[PDB]
Amino acid sequence: GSSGSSGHFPARVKVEPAVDTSRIKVFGPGIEGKDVFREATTDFTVDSRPLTQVGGDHIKAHIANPSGASTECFVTDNADGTYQVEYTPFEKGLHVVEVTYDDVPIPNSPFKVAVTEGCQPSSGPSSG
Numbered sequence: 001g002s003s004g005s006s007g008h009f010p011a012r013v014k015v016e017p018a019v020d021t022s023r024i025k026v027f028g029p030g031i032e033g034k035d036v037f038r039e040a041t042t043d044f045t046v047d048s049r050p051l052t053q054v055g056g057d058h059i060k061a062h063i064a065n066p067s068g069a070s071t072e073c074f075v076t077d078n079a080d081g082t083y084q085v086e087y088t089p090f091e092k093g094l095h096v097v098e099v100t101y102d103d104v105p106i107p108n109s110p111f112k113v114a115v116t117e118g119c120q121p122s123s124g125p126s127s128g
Helices: none
Strands: 025-027 042-047 074-077 082-087 094-099 111-114
Touching: none
Parallel strands: none
Antiparallel strands: 025 042, 042 082, 074 082, 094 111
16 A cells, blocks of 8 residues: 545646657648649648558648638548548638647648639539
């Protein structure tokens, strides 16, 4: 028996990271800011070695518009080792994308995607 404290429930403890996620590389317009124009379908690719080899379901992102709103993110694992997240920003501006692998942020985030005035998907002239 060992106890020297009463009338107090000390539940303060730090949780150590069980993942590296320090060598994660993300390439694509969705993260660079090329075809991420407003109302445009843009997506990036997350290559991870020591994190996954045959794709996984432990990825999650969150876009933050410069106004306050947020663009829904759609992560798609190619069941090969890399992740493909697609999102359509309904606002032309710099958003803050926060990535977290297994409840752990990467040394690349937060990210900054500066959208530029491009074109509109407005439906009109059809090809066939």
